Design a protein that fits this description.
Strand content of chain A: 35-45%
Distance between the termini of chain A: 29 Å
Bound molecules: a molecule of 2 linked components (NAG-NAG), 2-acetamido-2-deoxy-beta-D-glucopyranose
Oligomer: part of a larger assembly
Chains A and 6 copies: Spike glycoprotein
Helix content of chain A: under 10%
Order of helices and strands of chain A: EEEEEEEEEEEEEEEEE
PDB class: viral protein
CATH class of chain A: Mainly Beta
Keywords: SARS-CoV-2, Spike protein, viral protein
Organism of A, B, C, D, E, F: Severe acute respiratory syndrome coronavirus 2
Entry title: Cryo-EM structure of SARS-CoV-2 Spike D614G variant, two RBD-up conformation 1
Number of domains of chain A: 1
Strand order of the largest sheet of chain A: 2-13-12-11-6-15
Chain lengths: 216, 465, 270, 50, 35, 49, 50
Amino acid sequence: AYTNSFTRGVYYPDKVFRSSVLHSTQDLFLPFFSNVTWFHAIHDNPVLPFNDGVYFASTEKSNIIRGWIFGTTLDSKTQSLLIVNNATNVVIKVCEFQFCNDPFLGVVYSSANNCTFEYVSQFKNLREFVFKNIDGYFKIYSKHTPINLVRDLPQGFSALEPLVDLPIGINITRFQTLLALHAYYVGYLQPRTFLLKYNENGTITDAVDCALDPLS
Amino acid sequence: ETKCTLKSFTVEKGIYQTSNFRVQPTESIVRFPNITNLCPFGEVFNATRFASVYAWNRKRISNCVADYSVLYNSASFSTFKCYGVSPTKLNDLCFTNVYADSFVIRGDEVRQIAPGQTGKIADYNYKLPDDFTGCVIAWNSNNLDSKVGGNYNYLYRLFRKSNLKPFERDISTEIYQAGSTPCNGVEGFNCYFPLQSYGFQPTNGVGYQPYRVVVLSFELLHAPATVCGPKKSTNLVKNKCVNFNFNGLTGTGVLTESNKKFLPFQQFGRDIADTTDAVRDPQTLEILDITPCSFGGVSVITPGTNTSNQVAVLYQGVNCTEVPVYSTGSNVFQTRAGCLIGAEHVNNSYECDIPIGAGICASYQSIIAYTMSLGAENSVAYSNNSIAIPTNFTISVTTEILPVSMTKTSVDCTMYICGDSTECSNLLLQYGSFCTQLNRALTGIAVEQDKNTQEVFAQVKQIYK
Amino acid sequence: ICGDSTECSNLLLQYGSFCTQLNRALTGIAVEQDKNTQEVFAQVKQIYKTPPIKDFGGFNFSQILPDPSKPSKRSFIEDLLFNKVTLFNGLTVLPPLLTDEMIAQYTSALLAGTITSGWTFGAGAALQIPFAMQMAYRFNGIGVTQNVLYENQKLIANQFNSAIGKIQDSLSSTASALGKLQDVVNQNAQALNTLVKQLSSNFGAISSVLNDILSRLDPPEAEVQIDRLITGRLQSLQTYVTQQLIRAAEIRASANLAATKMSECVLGQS
Amino acid sequence: EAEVQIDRLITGRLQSLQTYVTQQLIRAAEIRASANLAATKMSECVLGQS
Amino acid sequence: FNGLTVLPPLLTDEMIAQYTSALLAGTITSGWTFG
Amino acid sequence: ICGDSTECSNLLLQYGSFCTQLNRALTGIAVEQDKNTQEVFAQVKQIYK
Amino acid sequence: NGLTGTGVLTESNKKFLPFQQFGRDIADTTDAVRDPQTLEILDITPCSFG
Ligand SMILES: *[C@@H]1O[C@H](CO)[C@@H](O[C@@H]2O[C@H](CO)[C@@H](O)[C@H](O)[C@H]2NC(C)=O)[C@H](O)[C@H]1NC(C)=O
Ligand SMILES: *[C@@H]1O[C@H](CO)[C@@H](O[C@@H]2O[C@H](CO)[C@@H](O)[C@H](O)[C@H]2NC(C)=O)[C@H](O)[C@H]1NC(C)=O
Ligand SMILES: *[C@@H]1O[C@H](CO)[C@@H](O[C@@H]2O[C@H](CO)[C@@H](O)[C@H](O)[C@H]2NC(C)=O)[C@H](O)[C@H]1NC(C)=O
Ligand SMILES: *[C@@H]1O[C@H](CO)[C@@H](O[C@@H]2O[C@H](CO)[C@@H](O)[C@H](O)[C@H]2NC(C)=O)[C@H](O)[C@H]1NC(C)=O
Ligand SMILES: *[C@@H]1O[C@H](CO)[C@@H](O[C@@H]2O[C@H](CO)[C@@H](O)[C@H](O)[C@H]2NC(C)=O)[C@H](O)[C@H]1NC(C)=O
Ligand SMILES: *[C@@H]1O[C@H](CO)[C@@H](O[C@@H]2O[C@H](CO)[C@@H](O)[C@H](O)[C@H]2NC(C)=O)[C@H](O)[C@H]1NC(C)=O
Ligand SMILES: *[C@@H]1O[C@H](CO)[C@@H](O[C@@H]2O[C@H](CO)[C@@H](O)[C@H](O)[C@H]2NC(C)=O)[C@H](O)[C@H]1NC(C)=O
Ligand SMILES: *[C@@H]1O[C@H](CO)[C@@H](O[C@@H]2O[C@H](CO)[C@@H](O)[C@H](O)[C@H]2NC(C)=O)[C@H](O)[C@H]1NC(C)=O
Ligand SMILES: *[C@@H]1O[C@H](CO)[C@@H](O)[C@H](O)[C@H]1NC(C)=O
Ligand SMILES: *[C@@H]1O[C@H](CO)[C@@H](O)[C@H](O)[C@H]1NC(C)=O
Ligand SMILES: *[C@@H]1O[C@H](CO)[C@@H](O)[C@H](O)[C@H]1NC(C)=O
Ligand SMILES: *[C@@H]1O[C@H](CO)[C@@H](O)[C@H](O)[C@H]1NC(C)=O
Ligand SMILES: *[C@@H]1O[C@H](CO)[C@@H](O)[C@H](O)[C@H]1NC(C)=O
């Protein structure tokens, strides 16, 4: 299934405060009015290629979507990233793990050979995520506040603010979502040029594409 | 200074610009994150037990902020020498990762830990690579190893002809029996255990007392930096021209309090053209401001070298309270265009001759600076049934000067930049037709001047007498 | 181009004495513009004042004469004009020599002189004359006999008052009629802004900040990097100076034309 | 290395010459305008009455 | 010199003086009819 | 200055924005010329025969 | 004595103090110089071109 993404997918590019200034940037963004592969994994989580950062969304306000396993071969031969939830803290483990056919998670574990790094941190609800890997740095941008402009579809304008940064420095060419045992959108992003308008308080209030329309 | 910038011994009446002044900085401030992730080095050097020389333990350290100065000054070490790296500067070095290897040896085996060396343990238990190693730290351990240590708990490998590759372990306990022709022509005999026990006694000398030896190996430029030495900081100052180095962002200016609001994830704001205008210190997390320190050009107003020998100096666009004979001089007069010193201020107003600005100007009566006057003042007695008719007339003669031409000049093209050289002329050929383009304009200008003069003067066809 | 750096100045002082002409061109154009405004506006040797009682044969000049209750002592049309249009890294903007009050006084004196006296105040001493007998002369000048004026005075007064009211309302309501001044201001501001923005360019060096490349390498190639940055910035400054000179020349031509128009039309008849 | 040295000298002198030429062009244009004004004044105010 | 030169004007000063004298004599004697 | 080469564009985008004011000046003089000829010739409101 | 140049030489009329070696007027233009053998002052000027 295909869904039209109206205007979602704008994030703060850097850590610089601005006010009442029109700023033009050239960065990896989600093109406006694009197509996203709507999934219906309800009584179905195939593996999707990474391809230079991925968008992600969800519309269910409970703990069913848990983790996102990353890697290039999904085997103990090469290190694989794991980011999982616990309803009390979020833990990240890049240590090598073996293959899993139908992993189950919610509130799989095969081996921990050559463990290297660990990290511990803290209408329905929309959870919008952006995963990026640049110069060996892993970046995750997140937004958890939904707005009901229209029902059954994610329409509206919202910004994404960074949470964490990881200096791992590994190759990622493959990822997979993890479920439990008993409707999320996926999109790719391209190096576009955007124009952004900042409020007087430093919040992005409007975005304009630079390669869409003659008026643009 | 006016005579210097004019390059003459005579100066006529007027105002000249000599140089500019700036306010010098006084001190410096450096800040860094309040927290400091301490690396647990305690469990390494003060571990309860160490492994053997043939089975040394390798431990991994990363994402740490470790200080070597706090350990460099410690005198609890027998020897701490490092190869190719200055320990004192280790506090200001960022490496990708660090490997640690702790163990215990005899007294005389300390010298065996060095690259390009020969020895039983240098080539049979632990081989240093043929490159730079981080360094080795050794200290006495007779208190806990030569007095209460196990009599055979420490073992070495007397296994020769098996030179190990650097950073390699052979913990395989296999009896050394060749079982072939090259051992007395027999199989099974000449069987020696690869391991052998150290022989130590309480205070038996210096070469037999076991010593703790730890090798630390660094990696540089293999990955993004993970471990770095701690950085110091200081307090902050306000309303002073200071150079600042806030956690990487460096600059100069004056610090003031601010009323702006930052979202909880930005670091420093700006307005335009990459000009920082607000930074928050990591320790306090308070919003501040940056303002460039005051500066500007100076000017000298003089009535002329001939008439007098006294001048007045003016600072342009400076609210001069930080002014440092003319350091303070005469009365200071702050105006809309900076501040003037060296001339008294009068209360009347006359015509103006030496303009200054903002409606004020100075003249030499001492030098007096006043406000420009627009002229005389009169009111005509307007009425609806009255006229004024002149009764006499005068004839006047005036003058009017108008330039019509300037001196015609020409500049040789290759001569100016070559000076009669064949190499310069040869290398000038690779720059295209710049020469002809520069040469044509001067001839065009000369022709234009000739035509201009001929047209402006030649307006009659005959000559009258 | 240096920002208070020692080695930067040491490398800069070997490119000749260009700063002398760079500053002298700007000083020359500043003096030129001061002379321009001085010659445009300084055309009267005295400062006349309007009579306290005004009876100009039925005409009404209230909306054009200065109002003695305003903070700057300016008339209505001047206030509308002022309210209509509206618009630091080692460069400064000098204040003008003549302030707003002096210009307002000059315009008030010129208007009072051309109302009470006529053309006689531009060629000697001011001479009193009733307004009706000046309108008679001005009609007689263009071929229409003076008999027309004295028998059609009320119609002319009413038409003039209606026209001045209409033009005041048009200025108050209709915008975009002051394109030239706004264009000049925008051009100047944009040129200054882009000159400031030119700093951030890399110019092919390692970084756009001097001290960072100064503190991360040794002088053998730091010299080359500094030279590249210096030559790029010098080229940018030269281009800016050339554009400023061209604009100053054009403004001088326009000011000369305006001065000629004011000297001919206002002080007499065309 | 003489080529490098002479390249440096040549480029510097070329920039100086370009600046001089541009300044002369501007001054010549201004002088031409002033002389045209003078010619108009002399043609009008001498051979007639203004 | 060292590469630079100054060309002489086409009209000498005596010719300019003669033009001025001719114009002035014409405007004294004839008025403005000779224009 | 290059004629369809990428390595140029990569190197040239680092030099600043000279082309911006170059094109701005060219368009300005073109528009000024058009307005100039329009003002010179268009001096009447009607057409007579 | 290592100082190379091209021009015509003439007997000089200027006076050197007993400790100079040469002289100039504007921008390194060597106008006079004393020979290293006879200790006689001479003046140098380039020959005609145009
Ligand atoms: C991703 O994989 C590529 C190989 O396909 C890595 O490139 C090599 O990395 C090794 C590091 O062990 C270098 O020694 C080689 O010189 C690299 N070769 C090439 C052609 O790049 C790359 O480093 C990997 N990326 C990460 C982040 O691990
Ligand atoms: C920026 O923040 C200020 C401060 O909170 C906001 O101003 C408030 O606006 C609301 C309504 O918009 C008023 O009820 C408050 O009284 C205002 N407070 C102050 C101190 O001014 C402003 O709206 C914000 N701008 C945004 C979010 O665009
Ligand atoms: C910064 O480190 C200092 C060192 O203890 C501490 O600063 C105190 O911060 C608290 C707020 O958390 C204030 O109430 C105190 O007045 C501060 N000073 C002292 C002497 O306690 C604190 O650990 C850190 N402050 C932060 C992170 O804001
Ligand atoms: C290993 O243990 C010794 C025990 O004395 C530590 O020595 C400390 O030295 C500092 C500095 O003089 C004292 O303030 C402490 O009281 C000492 N003891 C302790 C337990 O800290 C030494 O620092 C330890 N080193 C490592 C690497 O663990
Ligand atoms: C120059 O700066 C000084 C401050 O150093 C200004 O002094 C102010 O004077 C007024 C009236 O006397 C006081 O109300 C203010 O409190 C003073 N300022 C401060 C910071 O205390 C002075 O006005 C400034 N001059 C100009 C021309 O701006
Ligand atoms: C107009 O003014 C002139 C002077 O500008 C008067 O001529 C003067 O007359 C007095 C009295 O006879 C003589 O003493 C002067 O020598 C005269 N001056 C000159 C230059 O000749 C003339 O009389 C005035 N005309 C009227 C009508 O008052
Ligand atoms: C000149 O015109 C002005 C236009 O504003 C007149 O001012 C207003 O005139 C109307 C009627 O004449 C009055 O109702 C208003 O009260 C006036 N306003 C002000 C602010 O005065 C002015 O009266 C006219 N003058 C003459 C002599 O007719
Ligand atoms: C000339 O034109 C004027 C204005 O167009 C005429 O004056 C108008 O006359 C009408 C009819 O009496 C009045 O309603 C208007 O109020 C007048 N206007 C003004 C401004 O006073 C005038 O009548 C015309 N004269 C002739 C001979 O046609
Ligand atoms: C999305 O896909 C649908 C069906 O394949 C198509 O009709 C539509 O044009 C696509 N939209 C975009 C933006 O590609
Ligand atoms: C989840 O939380 C529980 C209790 O807080 C803890 O015991 C467990 O180790 C956690 N697991 C993960 C994967 O974080
Ligand atoms: C663990 O991974 C690191 C990655 O650099 C590698 O050097 C090391 O040999 C690995 N160890 C084992 C036992 O595979
Ligand atoms: C100074 O002024 C006096 C008075 O006019 C004059 O006589 C003298 O020549 C002047 N000297 C100089 C050097 O200008
Ligand atoms: C000028 O005189 C007035 C009248 O007393 C006074 O208020 C004012 O301060 C004086 N101005 C100066 C500069 O002394």
